């Protein structure tokens, strides 16, 4: 996990959302020292357990109510239970990762500090801060608007089925913990995306420095710079591996949640399109599909960019080899090429899959198969 001053707002958002139980103090040097915060550790654990319990309690209440609003049919019951469970598992994995990833966070931030010192020429505090805040604000505003639309639509739908001998609005009110879990999931995804995008951006800055200092006494300093760049590349690879070892289960459950959410939301949209009982419901389902696809991209594109930027450095190094003649600098470039030949760049989600754009294709296939089975199941 990355905890830097430009992106400290994302850190605070994740902290209040039970995902970053760390206490950070900014040094007089501008560095952010990180340690365990037991108060926020127990707060995160308790909030996660309480909200999961409340979410499932509301689910059971809807299922056991006189007029269920969402959990009415066996198919609807199963789909809604799966939708709630994927969110619960994703947020629980994120909280667990944030609880037991302090050492990885410290190592990653130290490595990023040395890399930024090496790449001080391309650091943009203002631009990085604004990109981080914009991503966080856009994600939170999108989820807030979407939750408002969903709750309003479901309140209208529940009032449409309201019978004088029962209240169906409390059923919708009991689904608020699920939306809180959605907010926690959005914060976790924003944090992971910020970290992965920072890693990829640093890879790109390293490649730009390589191309600008080697393709655009003194040779000794140039070789020292190349050694520093190679060390930064190795440290960025290790930072990617740390992010993986820390949040791979979280990323895996996020991907599972995206897949199941897309399938379930498309199934609900198809049902409403056949029945055409409501149009606002249809548009809310389209917005949910867009949100799920956008967050799938949010979790996929960062790792793909990081791997792509790290795997394009070997070509630059080959160019330097072909253009370099100095003995010590040529030897340093040879060492760098050897180091890059065996670089493991792709992000691994607990070893189950390598997170890149190819996943999307696979996802589509699954979303093409299951959803179509599900549709066939409706007919049958």
């Amino acid at each position: 996990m990355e905890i830097s001053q430009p992106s400290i707002g994302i850190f605070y958002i994740s902290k209040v959302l039970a995902l970053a139980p760390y206490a950070t103090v900014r040094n007089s040097k501008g560095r952010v020292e990180i340690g365990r915060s037991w108060l926020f550790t127990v707060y995160s654990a308790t909030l996660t357990v309480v909200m999961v319990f409340l979410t499932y309690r509301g689910l059971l209440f809807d299922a056991n109510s006189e007029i269920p609003v969402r959990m009415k049919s066996a198919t609807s019951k199963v789909v809604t239970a799966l939708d709630v469970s994927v969110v619960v598992m994703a947020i629980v994995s994120g909280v667990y990762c944030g609880l037991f990833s302090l050492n990885d966070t410290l190592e990653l931030n130290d490595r990023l500090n040395k890399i930024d010192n090496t790449l001080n020429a391309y650091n943009n505090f203002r631009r990085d801060r604004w990109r981080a805040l914009g991503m966080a604000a856009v994600s939170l505003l999108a989820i807030s608007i979407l939750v408002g639309l969903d709750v309003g639509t479901w309140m209208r739908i529940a009032q449409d089925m309201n019978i004088a001998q029962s209240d169906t609005e409390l059923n919708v009110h009991w689904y608020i913990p699920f939306y809180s879990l959605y907010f926690i999931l959005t914060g976790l995804q924003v944090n992971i995306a910020n970290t992965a995008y920072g890693l990829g951006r640093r890879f790109g800055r390293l490649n730009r420095m390589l191309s600008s200092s080697f393709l655009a006494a003194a040779a000794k300093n140039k070789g020292l710079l190349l050694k520093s760049l190679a060390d930064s590349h190795e440290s960025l690879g290790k930072c990617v591996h740390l992010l993986s070892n820390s949040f791979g289960i979280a990323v895996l459950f996020i991907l599972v949640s995206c897949l199941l959410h897309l399938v379930a939301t498309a199934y609900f949209l198809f049902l409403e399109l056949l029945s055409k009982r409501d149009n606002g419901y249809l548009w809310v389902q389209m917005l949910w599909i867009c949100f799920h696809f956008l967050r799938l991209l949010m979790v996929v594109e960062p790792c793909h960019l990081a791997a792509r930027e790290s795997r394009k450095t070997i070509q630059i190094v080959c160019e330097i080899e072909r253009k370099v003649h100095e003995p010590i600098l040529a030897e340093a470039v040879k060492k760098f090429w050897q180091q890059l030949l065996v670089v493991d760049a792709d992000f691994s989600a607990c070893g189950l899959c390598r997170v890149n754009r190819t996943i999307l294709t696979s996802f589509a296939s699954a979303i093409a198969t299951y959803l179509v089975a599900l549709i066939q199941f409706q007919r049958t």
Copy 2:
């Protein structure tokens, strides 16, 4: 994108079809300088938007007509809408790529110029021009004949359902913009295929030169030639990567269109084969299947050939190593082997997939699954 004098006809076809909004002037040296053409840029954008709007307007008109011709049943409505949407998305991606790929086009053509200068011994202006013109003419004639057959069949079918209180021929007439989109798609595919086939052909020429100059004072010139060949190979790899970064979204949507078109056309053929209402319709569907498969090959085989030709150069270089003894030439061959060891040759469609013949297999599986679900859906 490749814009050369031998294939200038393909460039003009793509330009009038809203895909190559560039102004080209032939120098006294025979070189083709390329720049942005704002007139044709706005013409391409406006034509794309207008024809997409007209296509979807005709779709809605057919769906909302008294006697729909094509959009009659929910299954038929969905299938026809998907068929039209894949074409719309493919042509829109191609137009967008041609609009925002001027720098990549310039770089690719400069690189191809230097490569052709290096490979002047195997350049065949007449043969290249005739192959390009033959490909373009065959593609355009095939799509024209197929559109004529389809429109005649659909006119007959609409007249068969004609009731005195309505005209069903205007429904077919309103599907002409869709056929125009098909022409644009054919032009885009022809252009992409010409570029990729040129890259693969240059790879093959480079390999032939390697084998004829190294396996079939003076050693200094031979090493200079080997250095030029290595530079040409690296430039061809970068040209492949430029073509990818420029038209990968277009290739991806072309592949999606081919898959969905094959599935939908096979479904329609199976329906007509059960009902046997018309035989000309069945033969037109078979011709459509052939056309879609042929254009899938048109987009797949070029990249496969390019990768295959680029990946077989390392074996030739190993042979030279095993046969070369001169110091400087041996060092140059070692440098070339090192360069080839880390060559990224496969064509990437926006990172979603690597375009090669393996895709075909996968496609078949999908075409075996979805189509079979679709058939089962008819029964259900």
Copy 3:
């Protein structure tokens, strides 16, 4: 197969379970010499044949009984027959592997002896013995408890269908050989897991020694130590390949059994959840799903860990290269890097698949497809 003093209990369990027909004598040096035991060879073969015959005889008896308990419906008959056949094939493959893998076992144990001598600094006899005994005891206790629950549930179910003109409890009693096959399968899986986990643990110890002796006269001894570590790594790779060549068919049938068992047990759970005839049956099916998933992990995680630990040594060697300066030691490290560049670490199940965590994903897809077809089949 690994036969060591710490894990000799697992060896005895596999021996009485017809999986390790070897006679072992402990030398005065603490080494375990292994040879063929013809008495136990014929005992294993005869027990396997007899128990397979009894299992299938009980299956036929249930199918041909007046009131079948498990083999009642065509779907139930097929599912139960597949469930029994996967277990039979898995245990038969394990027994055959143990019968015809004496040379591989001897080679593997010799190699492990030399490796342990090399890694004597990290050997923990007590911890290894306790981990092995704990794994064996947990597996055997889990399968025993699960068999008891299953047999009690099926006895209750059979008594519920009991008619005065027939006894349905003998039908359940005739399924005891199948549970014995389950015990044999558990023992085989425990043995394979112990061997693979030992290989991975030795890889980890080798990497720890590398990092502690090279990143934490004399240089000659250090280079000798590095040569010994490289030899140990190569021997561990060859031990992995021996385990593969010996028990790959067994691992493949174990994976097939896990897949089919998960599908069938989930199908039975879904049936009981629709009918809700019994709740103990549902909980027993959940326990069976947990057991099958846990043993799938038991067979998958060891190979994944071994490959992961073997593939992370090249980065350590690159670090030594970047930090080493001595001539002979630098040459030894270069030799080690060259050796690691071409290391085949992944475990192969008879060439059909590479056993790692990715399999899980694929399995899920299959378990998502077949089971869903099976559910659709119930409706149809």
Copy 4:
């Protein structure tokens, strides 16, 4: 294609079966010179066309007969047509490959001659001849017995439906060309398997020679021997690539035929098992499944063995590196390691897939999916 004296019987079988239209003359040196045989070329082409026409004519006759025997139901018609078409396409691809693969055959046999001269120490004329003749005889006897059983079963079935106003035995008699196509397919598969197994066996002999001459004045001769072994390895790789470029389409259609045949035969077996009209039909379907699986293995295992034997030579070369000290011999071993690092060993079926054991897994998945759809289709 391999045409050697030990396997000349397989060559004659393929020649009379329209697959090897070559004239071979044995020199006084024992070498077999190969050339085009126009008589047998036209005989092969004419026989292929005539038998395909007769097969499809019998298919149409059965479909258009008063009482169809095999082509009765739409599902049965489609399945039988696909079964016949896969065989037709496989044999046509094999015949076309044999017609237009004379240059590849000559190159492959020259390379095999030089390799055998290099590996004269491990050549076993008697064993190779007997293995080739045994494979051919077993394949031909199996297909003959299976065709006899199938034709007898279908004659009985046709006589069971015989009505006094028509003859249903001529319908079975008109399916004899299909069995002739099966014989041609068996011969083609036997030839391809013999060639691929010879390549893999030569790879194994090369590895054995490496291990026996380097791990079990004079050093100059040893380095000469190593150079010859490296040349033999490169020639064997090129022979594999020649076999691919010559018969990849044939292998691809053989694999497609195996897949479709397994699916169709299992579907027919399931139908007969539900109806239980005949038991001999069921056993014949089981025998057909066994035959199709065995020929799938016949086409898969050879390439897998070749790749496995070629990919295990680099480890032996690393061992020699680690054990070799002589300057010239060490340099030769380094050259060999460099050559092996970039070896393309896997067999490619026209670029669609790499033929190895992994295919089997994929096949199973397909055979698990389609067949299950097909079963569901019966219910629907």
